[PDB]
Swiss-Prot record:
Summary of subunit composition and partner proteins: Monomer.
UniProt binding sites for Ni(2+) 1: 8, 10, 36, 122
Organism (species): Methanocaldococcus jannaschii (strain ATCC 43067 / DSM 2661 / JAL-1 / JCM 10045 / NBRC 100440) (Methanococcus jannaschii)
UniProt: Mn(2+) 1 binding residues: 8, 10, 36, 122
Entry similarity comment: Belongs to the metallophosphoesterase superfamily. YfcE family.
Name of this protein: Phosphodiesterase MJ0936
């Protein structure tokens, strides 16, 4: 019962691969991606990912419908929207690319969710506010910070841990 969390891969192929290996060498039932993958060829790398995918559109992802298609061709279960609102392992998630701050801020403040995941900032953080678990996996690419990361959330114990690439 492990869920992989990643974001802002920014076409960095090598790190996208280290991320896909790490996720496989783990249980990881599903992988959430918020960031901008950005280019279509990034999705061909994902055909090698075991887990189903839940993605969100980044403000940099230009090929929106084409991206949804390729994602599904890789697996009809995979989904991608601007905001994903779902329940997994008896926990209620709100996923989005940090992209729109007002919405992100409201999702945490509302208390309608257990876990909230976002990216955009490329600034990994992992905090708690009003019993809401707020997670930002950080930048898989490592461009702004020089520290490439991803993360893995234990659904039953509610335990998280960053993973430096
Ligand atoms: Ni970005
Ligand atoms: Ni962004």
């Amino acid at each position: 019962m492990k869920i992989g969390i990643m974001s802002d891969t920014h076409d960095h192929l090598p790190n996208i691969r280290k991320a896909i290996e790490i996720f496989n060498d783990e249980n990881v039932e599903t992988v959430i991606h918020c960031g901008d993958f950005v280019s279509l060829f990034v999705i061909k790398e994902f055909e090698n990912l075991n887990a189903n995918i839940i993605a969100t559109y980044g403000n940099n992802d230009g090929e929106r419908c084409k991206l949804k298609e390729w994602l599904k061709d890789i697996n009809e279960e995979n989904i991608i929207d601007d905001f994903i609102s779902v329940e997994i392992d008896d926990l209620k998630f709100f996923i989005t690319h940090g992209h729109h701050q007002s919405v992100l801020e409201m999702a945490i403040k509302s208390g309608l969710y257990d876990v909230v995941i976002y990216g955009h900032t490329h600034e990994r953080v992992f905090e708690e506010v009003d019993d809401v678990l707020v997670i930002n996996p950080g930048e898989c690419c490592g461009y702004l910070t020089g520290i490439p990361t991803i993360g893995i959330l234990d659904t039953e114990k509610k335990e998280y841990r960053e993973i430096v690439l």
